[PDB]
Amino acid sequence: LSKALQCSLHGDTPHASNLSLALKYLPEVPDVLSCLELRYKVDWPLNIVITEGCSKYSGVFSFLLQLKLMMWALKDVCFHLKRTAMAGSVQFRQLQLFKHEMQHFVKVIQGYIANQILHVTWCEFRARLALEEIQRAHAEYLHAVFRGLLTEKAAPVMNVIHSIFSLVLKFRSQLHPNFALMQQSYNTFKYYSHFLFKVVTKLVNRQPHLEDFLLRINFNNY
């Protein structure tokens, strides 16, 4: 962390300190999980407002970090394949189209997160403020966890995301000795994605937040 803040080009203030990069579990040993927290710290006249439970940032953080694990690992195979280039054949071009087909799904679910949890939920609670109200207004700003698909109500929508993230990690393992072993993997990816579009649609009749998701995942397709 003390090496990270130097490369931030924004910070290194009294605010920038108090970033205890601690942990909460001891991992034993291809998955998409790496548990790790990141807790802010405050002092007395501010601790009375920012509750020691509003712990929920750590809930929304471990998701957002997990997302970066895709756009880096997927960037690796995009960079790992670059050095392979003479070698032009059907086995090659048909392989790279999988990456462009899998990357776009991550670059759209991220574009959603970068619209709900950082911009529109921040429009409120910024033009909303301008002593008891500060407790509730803050308890309504973060409650960012609803539009973030972390709520147990829309949990089945989140369970399917792991099946997507897992297959991309397997795609990174096989950095054409085993092409067919990868061809089966991509076909499993196109099925699960095609299943997501149905489970979200069926969950529209029962949440205006999810409405913008179908417009994101689907555009000139079915």
Binding site: W44, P45, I48, L131, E132
Partner: protein, 45 residues
């Protein structure tokens, strides 16, 4: 008068408590509870 002169002094110490943070209609009941804790919080800052 006699009851008033009692009430006028039977509330003397209670005003002092009220003079720190600075049935009946509940529209002001819960407000007094917070109107004091703010003063007791600024005293430590």
């Amino acid at each position: 008068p006699v009851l008033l002169s009692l009430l006028k002094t039977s509330c003397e110490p209670y005003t002092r408590f009220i003079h720190d943070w600075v049935v009946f209609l509940k529209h002001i009941a819960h407000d007094i509870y917070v109107c004091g804790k703010t003063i007791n919080l600024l005293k430590l800052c």
